[PDB]
Amino acid sequence: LLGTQYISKQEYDQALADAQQANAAVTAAKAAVETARINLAYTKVTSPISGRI
């Protein structure tokens, strides 16, 4: 609806906020998974050398 009529570009850009803002909120939550993924599959062996245990 941009260029054409109703959207009144700020009220678009108030929603272009909310996409760009909540996708950034995903990036917080996708890394919040990633912190809690590297506390889940982070158990344990080995310490990343490859040798004789």
Next chain:
Amino acid sequence: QTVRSSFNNINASISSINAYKQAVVSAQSSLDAMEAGYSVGTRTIVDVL
């Protein structure tokens, strides 16, 4: 009755004008709040029209 009627019609109609001429100045300003509002983007083209 008739002479006082038209004389009290035109006294109404003068104050009618200075109402609806002010009502232009509102609706001229409310339009120009849209043309300045649509050129920057807060109001849309239909709130203009």
